[PDB]
A paper describes a structure:
Heat-shock protein 90 (Hsp90) is a highly conserved ATP-dependent molecular chaperone. Most higher eukaryotic cells possess four Hsp90 homologs: two cytosolic isoforms, one of which is constitutively expressed while the other is induced by heat shock and stress (Hsp90β and Hsp90α, respectively), one localized to the endoplasmic reticulum (Grp94) and one localized to the mitochondria (TRAP1).
Heterodimeric (+/R417A) zTRAP1 was incubated with 10 mM ADP-BeF/MgCl2 for 1 hr at 30˚C to allow dimer closure. As predicted from the DEER results, the heterodimer adopts an essentially identical asymmetric closed state, and the C-terminal-fused SpyCatcher-SpyTag complex packs against its symmetry mate in the opposing dimer. The structure shows that the R417A mutation does not perturb the overall closed state. To avoid model bias, the dataset was refined starting with alanines replacing arginines at positions 417 on both protomers. The Fo-Fc difference map (insets) show strong positive density for the arginine only on the buckled protomer (ATP state), while the R417A mutation is on the straight protomer (ADP state). This is completely consistent with the interprobe distances measured in the DEER experiments correctly representing the buckled and straight protomer conformations. Altogether, this demonstrates that the loss of the γ-phosphate contact within the closed dimer is a strong determinant of the corresponding protomer conformation.
Numbering used by the authors:
A (entry chain B): 85 to 148, 153 to 200, 209 to 372, 377 to 639, 652 to 717, 722 to 737
B (entry chain A): 85 to 152, 154 to 239, 242 to 369, 376 to 566, 588 to 638, 653 to 717, 722 to 803
Amino acid sequence: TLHNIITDTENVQGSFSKHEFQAETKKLLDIVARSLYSEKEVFIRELISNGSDALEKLRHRMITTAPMEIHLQTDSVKGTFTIQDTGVGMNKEDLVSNLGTIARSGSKAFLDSSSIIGQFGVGFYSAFMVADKVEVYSQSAEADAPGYKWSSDGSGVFEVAEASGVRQGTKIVLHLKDDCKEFSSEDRVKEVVTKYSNFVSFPIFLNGRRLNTLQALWMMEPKDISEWQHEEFYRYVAQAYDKPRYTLHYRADAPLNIRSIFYVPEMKPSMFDVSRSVALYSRKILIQTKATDILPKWLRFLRGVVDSEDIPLNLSAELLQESALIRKLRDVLQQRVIRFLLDQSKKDPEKYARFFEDYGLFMREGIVTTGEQSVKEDIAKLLRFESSALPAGQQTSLMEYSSRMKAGTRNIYYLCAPNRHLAEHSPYFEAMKQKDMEVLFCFEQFDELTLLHLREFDRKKLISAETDIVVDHYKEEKFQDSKPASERLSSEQAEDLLAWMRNALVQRVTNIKVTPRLDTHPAMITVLEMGAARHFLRTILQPTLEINTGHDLIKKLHALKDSNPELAQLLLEQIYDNAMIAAGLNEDPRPMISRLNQLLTRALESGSSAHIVMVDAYKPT
Amino acid sequence: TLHNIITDTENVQGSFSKHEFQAETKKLLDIVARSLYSEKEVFIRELISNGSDALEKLRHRMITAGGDAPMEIHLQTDSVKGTFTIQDTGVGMNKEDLVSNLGTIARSGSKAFLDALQNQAEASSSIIGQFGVGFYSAFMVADKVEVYSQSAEAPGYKWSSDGSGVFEVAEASGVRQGTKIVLHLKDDCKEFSSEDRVKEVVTKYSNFVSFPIFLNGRRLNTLQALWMMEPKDISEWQHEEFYRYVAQAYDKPRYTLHYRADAPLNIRSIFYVPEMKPSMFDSSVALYSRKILIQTKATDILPKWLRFLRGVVDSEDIPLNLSRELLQESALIRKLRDVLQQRVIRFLLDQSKKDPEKYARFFEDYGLFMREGIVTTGEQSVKEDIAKLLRFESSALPAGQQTSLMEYSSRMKAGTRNIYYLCAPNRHLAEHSPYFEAMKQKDMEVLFCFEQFDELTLLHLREFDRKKLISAERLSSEQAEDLLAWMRNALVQRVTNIKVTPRLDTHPAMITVLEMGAARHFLRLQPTLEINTGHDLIKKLHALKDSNPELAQLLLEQIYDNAMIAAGLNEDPRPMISRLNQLLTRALEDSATHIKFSKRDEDGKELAGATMELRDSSGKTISTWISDGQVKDFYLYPGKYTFVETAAPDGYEVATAITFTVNEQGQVTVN
Ligand SMILES: Nc1ncnc2c1ncn2[C@@H]1O[C@H](COP(=O)(O)OP(=O)(O)O)[C@@H](O)[C@H]1O
Ligand SMILES: Nc1ncnc2c1ncn2[C@@H]1O[C@H](COP(=O)(O)OP(=O)(O)O)[C@@H](O)[C@H]1O
Ligand code: BEF
Ligand code: BEF
Ligand SMILES: [Mg+2]
Ligand SMILES: [Mg+2]
């Protein structure tokens, strides 16, 4: 039944020889040049990072005055990229051991400055991605040493000679290959600096002009950032022209080190873009997330930045193609954002209402597409509704509903209608008012779908009014009519009428019934799973028609079936249609307009009238 | 104002030494085992790739120096000891090859083997390894690695290391032909001694590896790489099954494209379009190379608008990043994306011919993707490529029938080069557009674009076929004028115009709109109601406005609402139902009493030309008019009034004023 081959069979014979690992240097160089970094442009990042590190080491040495800066120069005529830093520079032994040895990083021995970027000992070789020839001039700041020129074609060997006129620091000259002339373009080189190296701690000059490098706001003390600095920084990170309506500046080292700023734009989101967002950093250097989480999909409306020292970097930079503790970070961020937004609702409900109006669709999306019930409920805390127990216009929440529920109660009742007036005057609400439960009023298009997917909240089942009305037939229909029996059809009249209606609506309705639960309305359509039926139509519903035998229209229909039978049927058809529309279960309303106009004319029938008459006498002469 | 210190101030002084690049072996091992891959689980991919390569070399040897051995990769987990073991029955390694290949970073025996083959040999395209580092991925997850290997030539060996710069080699007995690798897993990596976990990783990366893969004596990879087979030797049921696997889906593909080509690059690929339409409540095309997963969500190979496709793309010669989970930046990959874009467009176009019906359903479901593509791309040539897939309706065609921009370009009058469209919520609002009524009479055909984002699509399209798209953008004569003047006051802030028109027939009124752009924002407004003065409800409305003003208010409101519905401008009439019910009950049951006034001669025939006033008991003139040879209607409320003749026509005597009373019961008396 099983096919295995692996067995404990092997035994060592005699002694072992010991060996050291070695390297195929030529092929390592090729790997760094062609196979290590997925984008050619990052040689700029790597060289700037090296210059920044050389400057940090000098700064640190300076404590134990001169300028500390990084210069870039593009010669589009000579096809040349030059970078020069005023840092510690390198001696002969340093040029040989650090530059000449792959995976050797002098920026490690440096152990006494979380400012140091360099780690791997390969970044420098990225120059050979874009250059036939690389020359290095370095002057190890120190009374002893002289200058040096380091030189290589990138294959196999390199040569070093003593040099004069070498300024303190290091200059590196890239003779660009014809493939890569784009990096002798000033506009091109500028694009790259501001992409990866825009938060570097020393000034960078490009062809004599100082680049507008920035402060890493996310690393700084939240209380020291003014609203205006956030406005500006938002515009930078979101590449936007408006300002944030909310700003969340979150630091933690709790489960994981986190330094982050999130913004909600003041603009409403584009509906085009919704169907068609935060940057990830470490050590002030950009790190890529294409095809990665950081935030869950429903929080893609947020803009801003996340930095976490617990995220390891691969040898290139990207990495972000993971699920480890990213999934954790994402869960932490989601929780914190929900808490932030709940707090904004407390502070300023009216402002939150505007937020919810503009961004609520993201919450609904999040509830609908999550499989995790606890997450659905967390996000659900952000939803807002009106209530039958609160004045019109006043927003409430599932939490506040829960806190008004009497000790006995175990369900949350809701009603979805286009607006406050229609909900308040809904036949489904009239029926519910005979009970003493609070009803949530939900006015937005996908609120019902949302609550259907939510299903329950804090162990309380969500039930639509329409559903609850149906369920009550299968319990005690112990409800009394709104009007005394004198204002209703007698039983004999009700039965006679119903039997007529059943014949007139044979294959349109499952059954027809009187209900004591209506007041203003002549009838209503009921369906057990009303919400799901409404949802299905967005592309027969064993519907029940329930009539109010106290309503003027119903009573008139009773008469009409024996006086103008054809008019009675037209009326009946219209009452059903009106109940289907009120139920939200109506197909195209256009084909009913014909009947309605016809009905309207036949209903509306002048009379006879009283005449006052004046005679004009003729004059004589 | 500039600051530069870069100057040619250096000079080469004296002689120079030549030095060879070196390599810090210790640190480099750490880099592979720590800082190379996004996930630790990837050591399983690498070791299986190596077993596949070993097997492939053995298979190649036996073509020529034939012999008889089964070709298999075996994995074993031990959850008590915390070990992961992989064994292949491939070509194995002698002592020299263990020291050379395993002991030297970036040395690849498999690469050398590849370089010596005829490019035509099958092993040329199935050997995976290139870099000579994949093996060091074991130290990511293992404190100790043991390799037992027995070459196919004329002694077994055990290679052993902790991964800290040294390794040991000793002779070993009992080693089976091939190679066995035993990982003693780190404490934080013990999950790879779990069978279920290892199974997840094997199926993720290595499910299509050419050789049988066993785990704890059970076979895993039962899935053959359909994209490498001849399109003709694959059945519809194989596609359905493969689709479901590769898309993780449960429906069938509505469309299947099996594309092979050796052109800009080796391509073996299969694309599917799902049968199920997508929505809000919510995999991609995967990238492979030599049957191994590179990216579950391929990024650079397709344009974003084709993200609705599922399936797989495999290329043997696509340039891989060292991590094997990315592609290098490449002009070849750019060309590939362009080629695929064109192939899929070509395929969908062909499908619109073979079955326009089916393609019509496809365009309804996925058309938004095409519209997005046209808006987001910057190449005019490609915009017009994707635009060949668009369907609209036309002014020159019946309702509900689709046409392409090409078919429009077909029918155009010989002396013209302009594409006229009109983006409307619906057909009614289109056919009755002022701007379109222009193009009806003198000019000719207009595209009707009802779908959302149809507008900015064409705006972004700009130009198609070297041509330019441009948006083309009873009751008497005084009874009616009276009615109109009343209507403008009850609907003061609902419409910006009220007209009278002779169409309608069955319809008492219709809504028309000038700007379609507005109407969208409205259901995203300045309507124009137009009245049929021959319609019974309108003539009823006319009569009730004075007689039963409150009833005529409901009726008016209803006629307006009914017209907005008939124009598709109000899709959810819930706001009107309570009112409509009031209208019905009141219609089936006025306060003002109808009073008809006759001015006559001595024979009792109606007399024109008399100036008349009606005044109330206070003396106030309520109304002044001239008799015109027919009866005059008034509607008065309870009180006392007087009809006064203020001028008689020439040759007639002025009659005595007539005083009358209307009471609360609607009965009238002359006093
Ligand atoms: N501009 C510079 N000035 C001084 N030292 C430098 C400079 N650039 C590189 N180095 C030295 O060379 C080493 C190698 O650089 P690189 O290959 O990028 O590795 P790292 O990851 O250490 O930065 C560094 O560790 C540093 O000691
Ligand atoms: N299971 C095996 N059987 C025989 N040879 C192997 C096996 N695994 C690895 N090798 C040899 O070791 C070399 C190093 O493997 P690896 O570091 O993955 O580099 P590569 O990219 O060449 O596969 C291979 O080129 C191959 O010659
Ligand atoms: F700049 Be080093 F390679 F991290
Ligand atoms: F498996 Be090798 F490093 F490509
Ligand atoms: Mg560096
Ligand atoms: Mg390998």
